[PDB]
Amino acid sequence: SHDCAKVDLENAELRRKLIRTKRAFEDTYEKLRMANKAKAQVEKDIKNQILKTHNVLRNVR
Amino acid sequence: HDCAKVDLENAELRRKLIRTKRAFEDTYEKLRMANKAKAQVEKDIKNQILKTHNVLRNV
Amino acid sequence: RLECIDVCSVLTNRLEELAGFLNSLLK
Amino acid sequence: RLECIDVCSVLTNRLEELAGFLNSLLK
Ligand SMILES: [Zn+2]
């Protein structure tokens, strides 16, 4: 069959790697989510500035 | 231990680590692309600010 | 219906707020 | 320098480019 010690060590190592990789993915994902929210707000404010600017320009003519 | 159990857990942990690694590399890649776009956009914005203030100051 | 000096003022105010807004994008 | 009509023109051109630029930020 297998080597008991070897698969135990691989098991512990895979659990450690999965904890590290999970934390890294949850952190990168969280930063991505914050960036998406900030994206929404900035796009709203930009749209507002575009509308003000075009109202000014159109009402100049 | 239980040989079958730790073999199954090892296979499952390897699959989970592949999925989680792929997810982290994809999310990280999107973050990096967003950082590059951040740099370029900040450059262009700075340029527009400078043009605008030059116009306003010369008024 | 605005005279030239008024147009200048309105454009200037819009431009000033746009400068401030872009600057706020850098933050 | 520059007379009021010229100021209006320069401000207008700056504002038009700023509108286009912000719109490009949405893309
Ligand atoms: Zn065993």
Author numbering:
A (entry chain B): 1081 to 1141
B (entry chain A): 1082 to 1140
C (entry chain D), D (entry chain C): 518 to 544
The authors write:
In flies, Centrosomin (Cnn) forms a phosphorylation-dependent scaffold that recruits proteins to the mitotic centrosome, but how Cnn assembles into a scaffold is unclear. We show that scaffold assembly requires conserved leucine zipper (LZ) and Cnn-motif 2 (CM2) domains that co-assemble into a 2:2 complex in vitro. Purified CM2 forms a stable 2:2 tetramer with the purified LZ of the PReM domain, and we solve the crystal structure of the LZ:CM2 complex, revealing that helical dimers of LZ and CM2 interact in an anti-parallel fashion.
We also solved the structure of several LZ:CM2 complexes that contained slightly shorter or longer versions of the LZ, again based on PSIPRED predictions. These revealed structural consistency in the four-helix bundle at the core of the interaction interface, while the coiled coils of both components that extended away from the core bundle demonstrated variability, both in terms of flexibility (angle relative to the core bundle) and the degree of order within the crystal. Two Cys residues conserved within Drosophila species in the LZ region (C521, C525) line the interior of the coiled coil, with C521 consistently forming a homotypic disulfide bond.
